[PDB]
Ligand binder design. Structure first.
Ligand code: GLU
Ligand code: GLU
Lengths: 276, 276
């Protein structure tokens, strides 16, 4: 039976499960401009909601969707503004001090988006340039560290979400946008002219996405992990991958044209929740 | 503007304010058996709810009542199961490490309820006796300490709420109930034979009640304290006192017959939030 102060207890007492989600983490958790929140990560959220309804024996449980940002997600989690989110949040040791993470749902590398035919091909080319990054991200930490340690004299623009960052780039307010490679591709899949944008640079990190939930709630983490493990080991996660990464997606019917990583091939066979 | 991770932000983002309340803290926050949650403390909760609706310019804001207990209130608070509660929670330094408290709304002393016809006149008379206390309370802490340090050989029965404690006493399962004096009087007011029961003993503590809210949320504490201050300094709090403590109350139409202390009168003129 759920313990006082656990998430299943909160949900049962409120009669609501509150699902945090992203607005612009494409193709993970984002708005389709068809009145829904969709994507590869959001498909896990939907599965988790069904598992909660089943566990609590409450099929008419209200489901509330609450938008969150990379900057605000931990504060909102910790006061119960939302109960869990599946999007584009990196599981790392630092964040484990504040939150818990499910089994890994995706793996990314941090790279650059830049205009084609410009002069940015590697991180070193950013010296003395304006560079945009989304506030509250691992890329913002990495980029500020690079700026200091490698003395690059970058002017770092911190934007509120990934589409704001992309539009900074698109409007010529920055020469490159640093982010998780998949998210860069996702922003390009919404662009005016997708052709105009290239992903370049050696990755500065390799990072695991997990669904995020409150710390010290083993029962809820187990529900989430068990749900993820069924999706992944049954072959369903790979079908979700193909849908969101190899086929036309909203809102512009463009294709990511990605291929499934070796890292996720191994995780779909034996799910785990380790930070990289 | 409410910061991310604050209670006003949570309320706005969820479209609801969740008010924790008691079931058996008489005459503070309790069920009237007329389909309402009522009492002297709950009157402050209603005032705070109105202040929230005004501050957020949300006149139709949903209000959800959630029952809590002495044992589960801090776990439930910390994961956002509820946003605030006004009842019978003591503000003390230890709990300030986990929660915040409003300006004080009442002051109690921890005493004993026992058969008027019986042998229990002070705490020392409890040696070798069965004594009931409500789980998760300051009285439970005090009573276990007294048992150990004074080697009293009491058999301590820990019941889930104040009415369960009283009914333990009434049914002959314990010789006395230790609790806040006002709460003892409130349970007596519901008894089969109220006249059978006496409040005895030297108080083991003097304790201040506050409404409880999350820690590190100055703006919500300020809204609550501002609301309380107006009620108290205008004379309304004493009218609420008279209503709940000097006139017949539900559910049995009996009277507490209490008098407002000079200390409370002094607080009502200049509100403050200090633990005793
Ligand atoms: N995965 C990165 C960037 C993407 C994001 O936050 O959406 C992070 O968790 O900081
Ligand atoms: N005021 C005490 C006892 C009453 C109660 O919890 O309701 C406490 O906060 O522990």
């Amino acid at each position: 039976a759920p313990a006082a102060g656990s998430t299943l207890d909160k949900i049962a007492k409120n009669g609501v499960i509150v699902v945090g989600h992203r607005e612009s983490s494409v193709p993970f958790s984002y708005y389709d401009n068809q009145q829904k929140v969709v994507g590869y990560s959001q498909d896990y959220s939907n599965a988790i909601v069904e598992a909660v309804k089943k566990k609590l024996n409450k099929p008419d449980l209200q489901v509330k969707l609450i938008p969150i940002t990379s900057q605000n997600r931990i504060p909102l989690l910790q006061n119960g503004t939302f109960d869990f989110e599946c999007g584009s949040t990196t599981n790392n040791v630092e964040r484990q001090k504040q939150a818990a993470f499910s089994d890994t749902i995706f793996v990314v590398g941090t790279r650059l988006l830049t205009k084609k035919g410009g002069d940015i091909k590697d991180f070193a080319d950013l010296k003395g340039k304006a560079v945009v990054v989304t506030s509250g991200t691992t890329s913002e930490v990495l980029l500020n560290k690079l700026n200091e340690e490698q003395k690059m004299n970058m002017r770092i623009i911190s934007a509120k979400d990934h589409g704001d960052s992309f539009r900074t780039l698109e409007s010529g307010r920055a020469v490159a946008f640093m982010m998780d490679d998949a998210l860069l591709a996702g922003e390009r899949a919404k662009a005016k002219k997708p052709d105009n944008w290239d992903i370049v640079g050696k990755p500065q990190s390799q990072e695991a996405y997990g669904c995020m939930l409150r710390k010290d709630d083993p029962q809820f983490k187990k529900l989430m992990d068990d749900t993820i493990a069924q999706v992944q080991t049954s072959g369903e996660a790979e079908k979700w991958f193909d849908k969101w990464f190899k086929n036309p997606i909203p809102p512009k019917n463009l294709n990511m044209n990605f291929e499934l990583s070796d890292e996720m091939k191994a995780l779909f066979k034996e799910p785990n929740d380790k930070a990289l």
